[PDB]
Design a protein around this ligand. Structure first.
Ligand SMILES: [Cl-]
Ligand SMILES: [Cl-]
Lengths: 180, 13, 182, 10
């Protein structure tokens, strides 16, 4: 699965004038995919303890607290909770983008959770929460990688900028250092 | 991974 | 052939108050609205026929929308249509006002076009309200994204390539556009 | 009526 269009949208928010090379985008895609897979796998395991074979935002949140190190978990939980609150708000938004305040599309995350057969059903809040978590991590990595590119006197993020940015951040290194 | 150089230089500048 | 241009513009000023649209881009917007109208109405006609219903109501429009629109787009469209019909359906009959539906798209015009198309013997008053709301919602989505594409391009007006790019990069809108034409 | 205007582009 390719998140490239959404990675690119997030990049334009955090570093409007910075590009990203094809190989750096591939690494970004692998990071998002790896985090999705591990959150979904933990959430699926957690769902067995409930009476209903359903992935809800509660299992996503618990999975995020297990998987994300240190303050990454605190901020991801804040982002996922805020997105679910906004998405379920009584005042309806007029567009999908305005409903959750996100760049990552809820429907794509929903389809990926359903495709993985993580449970019999996927609750309406779970893909919103997970999309917000993936967006938060993507924004964090791209912010740091774009800083590394600028310090390297480059106008595009290349793989060594991503590798340096992840390695030099203790929490991101724990989360991502095993991704190949 | 070397922090400098062009061993893996990608096109598009 | 029907012109929704006046209503497309009204929606454009809601989502991007300071963004214009060219004449050729408005023609593409108008063709999209007509294409979606025809596809939804055609499926609604089949649904009424196979269910032995002489009147198309919001029920067949809603089912057609669910068969045609994917993902979050379908959820929003159903929410928009259901909301408009509920608001429009006043408890006192013969006291209806189009203004109650809360829309920019013309309920009465959509009713006349549904009647003209001979999709069923009769068309209930809720069907054009629901359909107008869906057409307006899709217009708002496309104009939002196209206007974002124009803004990212440092343009103050939407041109055709902004519309095409906005639809192409939206998985759900791109899927829908592929189903309104043969 | 006062039809709104769009006109050509670039
Ligand atoms: Cl849920
Ligand atoms: Cl009706």
């Amino acid at each position: 699965e390719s998140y490239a269009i959404y990675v690119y949208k997030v990049l334009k928010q955090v570093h409007p004038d910075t590009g990203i090379s094809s190989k750096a985008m591939s690494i970004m895609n692998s990071f998002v995919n790896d985090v999705f897979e591990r959150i979904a796998g933990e959430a699926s395991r957690l769902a067995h303890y409930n009476k209903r074979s359903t992935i809800t935002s509660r299992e996503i949140q618990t999975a995020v607290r297990l998987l994300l190190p240190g303050e990454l978990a605190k901020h991801a939980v804040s982002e996922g909770t805020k997105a679910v609150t906004k998405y379920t708000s009584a005042k309806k938004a007029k567009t999908r983008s305005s409903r959750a305040g996100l760049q990552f599309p809820v429907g794509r995350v929903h389809r990926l959770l359903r495709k993985g057969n993580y449970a019999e059903r996927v609750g309406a809040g779970a893909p919103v929460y997970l999309a917000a978590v993936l967006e938060y991590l993507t924004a964090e990595i791209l912010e740091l990688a774009g800083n590394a590119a600028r310090d390297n006197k480059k106008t595009r993020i290349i793989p060594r900028h991503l590798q340096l940015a992840v390695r030099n951040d203790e929490e991101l290194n724990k989360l991502l250092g095993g991704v190949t | 991974p070397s922090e400098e150089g062009y061993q893996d230089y990608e096109p598009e500048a």
